């Protein structure tokens with residue numbers, strides 16, 4: 001994927017990862033509402049939809065998602081450095097009940113969050129680069145299923 005387009009489009013979002021990751025998750029739950037109970041059942045401190053989603057565990061996972069995307073961005077020129085990490089990350093999600101299909105919905109949610117932050121700066125070339133980068137991340141995780 002075009003590295004300069006990826007790095008530049010990620011800069012501002014990367015500086016406020018919880019705010020932007022929260023936008024991503026809201027879109028994800030809109031597209032795939034069955035993910036909400038999956039998080040709820042995996043939550044340990046609280047039990048309710050709302051208490052789980054505002055919990056440190058859930059906020060931690062938002063940061064983890066953004067950490068992984070940041071790892072893909074900073075390794076865009078050679079994602080081979082994340083192949084084993086991502087295969088294992090896929091195996092881990094499969095074990096907690098996540099479907100591989102849900103990661104395509106995450107991609108749609110990522111693109112939505114970037115377009116919301118960047119507005120007209122999110123060009124079709126920038127979209128294509130992200131689709132290719134995130135697709136490569138999902139391809140590497142798909143080894144886990």
Ligand code: HEM
Nearest residue numbers: 035038039042061064065068069092093096098102103106
């Ligand atoms: C599809 C929606 C997703 C759901 C429902 C979900 C749910 C979970 C759950 C329940 C865990 C705990 C796993 C465990 O205790 O072993 C987890 C771990 C994790 N998730 Fe996700 N996740 C999702 C998407 C993502 C994405 C897209 C990323 C990264 C881009 C990500 C990054 C992580 C990381 C880094 C961990 C910690 C893995 C570890 O324990 O080694 N998640 N996720």
